[PDB]
Amino acid sequence: GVARCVCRRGVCRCVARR
């Protein structure tokens, strides 16, 4: 439900975390 964006090794991903 909560969209959190995580950057990891050059990749930035906005992902829904429940």
> Helices then strands (H, E): number in the chain?
0, 2
Please state, in angstroms and rounded to a whole number, the distance separating the CA atoms of residues 11 and 18. 21
Six-digit token pair at 2? Answer: 């909560």
Query: Which letter does DSSP use for residue 3 in this model?
Result: E
Residue with tokens 């990749």: 11
Q: How was this structure determined?
A: NMR
Contact 4, 14 (CB under 8 A): yes
What is the C-alpha to C-alpha distance for residues 11 and 2, in angstroms, rounded to an integer? 19
